[PDB]
Design a protein around this ligand. Structure first.
Ligand SMILES: O=C(O)c1cnn2c(O)c(Cc3ccccc3)c(Cl)nc12
Ligand SMILES: O=C(O)c1cnn2c(O)c(Cc3ccccc3)c(Cl)nc12
Ligand SMILES: [Cu+2]
Ligand SMILES: [Cu+2]
Ligand code: NA
Ligand code: NA
Lengths: 213, 213
């Protein structure tokens, strides 16, 4: 109970576009806030948009906090991280552009991150995917998973991760780069294909189509 | 309701010495936490001592947050201020070395700070007090109040106050110096002589003697 801090990345921009009357960011915001495990939500957003969340503060069963976004996604995470409760035992990082994450999937990834130290929701990639070299030739082989959010990580591990990133200088080029640099295991919790990220005009449509089905 | 953020200055050090079994800092901590007006307490303390407060987190009706102290009292306040809720309408700064503040006095100073923008609990000075010049001669005259805490201030005013202090460079030498520099009025709410600050060995004794009377 109340052991999880959520860092909600929400920094109109796509995540504030209404989906059946409700700004996209609020769907996942509410799904987390209903979970007894979740103590607090740190929303990382431009101050312009804070009222979208703060309107619901006395109606939700979590503490709401805010953090200013950074230039890169990892900067926004770090800013978020600085606001979580000092004794939270797990941090749950979520992209607000994924409004359709199911409670049941969040529960799974929370359990796996608690168990392993670091877990991310993933689905099996449907496309044929190949590594290609700098001569544009296929790197051959004789299973790939697409990562979603949440990403759930013990805060001490995330902090050592940042310390390593900051000090060395090492690059974040994809969304699981910090934990990779540690030699700590990262579990992939199987999610749902419905947990789409809303990027395009077209995605907005897909999300409405899924909220009605 | 839940419009007030308390900045509790608690950065053994005197404020952690037991008074009938309970570290001094917890007396005012609990008095504020029982007040419906109070949304959150930001405790400004060395991380060593955080557990003293965090033990009571699920038993109190406020959000608990922490801030790292600074070198001067005003630095500790500013650190505190950076952690309060973005829409809190009043900040209540209290010295944890004043464990005996009465709820009724806190209520008064909250009302006065809300009304005026800035209020502090005070009592009439009992001693004969004189201004003295640099030749050690009395500066003559043909009513003085001793300030206590809480100090209650609208956060926007406290922030402009800090902006002015930081930029100009002006000195804080006493405990109402920031608001003085503004030309905004500061109301003195009459408190109680029992609201002692625990400094000496002897004070510790006085506080026990007052908790029993
Ligand atoms: O923000 C980025 O772009 C990023 C780059 N790397 N990386 C990470 O390693 C993590 C930690 C994590 C990965 C997998 C499962 C749980 C936590 C995060 Cl939360 N963001 C990033
Ligand atoms: O920390 C100090 O030493 C200090 C120096 N000046 N000053 C202030 O003007 C205030 C603001 C205030 C004063 C009176 C009533 C309400 C708020 C505070 Cl809260 N601390 C200080
Ligand atoms: Cu898409
Ligand atoms: Cu004394
Ligand atoms: Na509204
Ligand atoms: Na205890």
């Amino acid at each position: 109970e109340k052991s999880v801090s959520v860092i909600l990345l929400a920094g109109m921009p796509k995540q504030y576009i209404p989906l059946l009357g409700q700004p996209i960011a609020l769907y996942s915001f509410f799904t987390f806030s209903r979970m007894p495990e979740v103590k607090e939500i740190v929303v990382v957003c431009d101050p312009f948009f804070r009222d979208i969340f703060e309107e619901y503060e006395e109606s939700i069963d979590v503490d709401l906090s805010f953090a200013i976004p950074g230039k890169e996604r990892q900067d926004s995470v770090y800013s978020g991280l600085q606001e979580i409760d000092v004794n939270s035992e797990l941090v749950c990082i979520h992209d607000s552009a994924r409004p359709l994450v199911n409670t049941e999937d969040v529960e799974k990834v929370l359990k796996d991150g608690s168990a392993v130290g670091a877990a991310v929701l993933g689905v099996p990639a449907k496309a044929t995917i190949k590594e290609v070299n700098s001569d544009s030739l296929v790197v051959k082989t004789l299973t790939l998973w697409e990562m979603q959010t949440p990403q759930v990580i013990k805060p001490e591990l995330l902090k050592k991760g940042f310390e390593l990133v900051k000090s060395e200088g090492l690059e974040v080029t994809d969304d699981v780069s910090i934990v990779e640099y540690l030699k700590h295991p990262v579990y992939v919790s199987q999610g749902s294909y419905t947990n789409i990220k809303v990027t395009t005009p077209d995605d907005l449509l897909l999300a409405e189509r899924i909220l009605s089905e």
